[PDB]
């Protein structure tokens, strides 16, 4: 109901009507990236400079109807002045902390299921067992190794269709996945995330990260396993070796 209604409201005004009519689907990306905002050259300097202002961050308009304009002593939490090239309003950082102490609460039980990679890292480290540190010269030789320890033996494009069919089943188009490994992955990640309401985009991004294999060139000495490379900073050094066995093994 609503969606077509703001569609009609947009088409009511002449300029947006022209934009909707003359613009083709292919140009979607271009106009979406059409912005006057330059990409910052020195982000640290301005982040240290903007945070000294009042209302340094930006938030959706809806914040004006969930968080009061001021806190107990009267420190303002949000302003009604919109951003430069968006309908979002500039708000103070307190509106963040406020949201974490009296804002609406939900059931975050499914975030562990979504962010599978990070929670698997935590579980692997929690059950790890350290050993003695041995001091001897390490011959670090540079090798190509896979960093992602949960890659399902799929490439970027190869798993992209799987991700769409898992999250966006209707926009798949011609592709119907042939490999049965992809079939089982789709089934599992479909039944697992059937009602998760985090965001389609973040779900797709994390599925891409988990399933897609990624490789990088690093100086290693021993190890060479996927689980042993994520802790390469902790097990191998310039003149010391720290024996380690992740919780998985």
């Amino acid at each position: 109901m609503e969606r077509i209604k703001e569609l009609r409201d947009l088409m009511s005004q002449s300029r947006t009507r022209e934009i909707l009519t003359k613009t083709t689907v292919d140009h979607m990306a271009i106009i979406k990236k059409y912005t006057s905002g330059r990409q910052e050259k020195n982000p640290a300097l301005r982040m240290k400079w903007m945070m000294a202002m009042k209302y340094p961050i930006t938030a959706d308009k809806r914040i004006m109807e969930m968080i009061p304009e001021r806190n107990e002593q009267g420190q303002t939490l949000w302003s009604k002045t919109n951003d430069a090239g968006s309908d979002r309003v500039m708000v103070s950082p307190l509106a963040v902390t406020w949201w974490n102490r009296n804002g609406p609460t939900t059931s975050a039980v499914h975030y562990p299921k979504i962010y599978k990679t990070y929670f698997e890292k935590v579980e692997r480290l929690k059950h790890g067992t350290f050993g003695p540190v041995h001091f001897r010269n390490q011959v670090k030789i540079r090798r190509r190794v896979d960093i992602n320890p949960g890659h399902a033996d799929l490439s970027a494009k190869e798993a992209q269709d799987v991700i769409m069919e898992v999250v966006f089943p209707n926009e798949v188009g011609a592709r119907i996945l042939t490999s049965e490994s992809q079939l089982t992955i789709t089934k599992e990640k479909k039944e697992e995330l059937q009602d998760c309401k985090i965001s389609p985009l973040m779900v797709a991004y994390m599925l891409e990260r988990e399933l897609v294999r990624k490789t990088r060139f690093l100086p290693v000495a021993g190890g060479t396993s996927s689980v042993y490379i994520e802790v390469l900073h902790l097990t191998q050094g310039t003149c010391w070796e720290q024996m380690y066995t992740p919780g998985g093994e």
């Binding site: 041995h134 001091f135 001897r136 010269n137 390490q138 050094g237 310039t238 003149c239 010391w240």
Partner: peptide
């Protein structure tokens, strides 16, 4: 610390 590590790579001990 780089000095210390380089010297300790010679004698197998911190």
């Amino acid at each position: 610390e780089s000095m210390i590590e380089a010297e300790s790579s010679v004698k197998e001990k911190d």
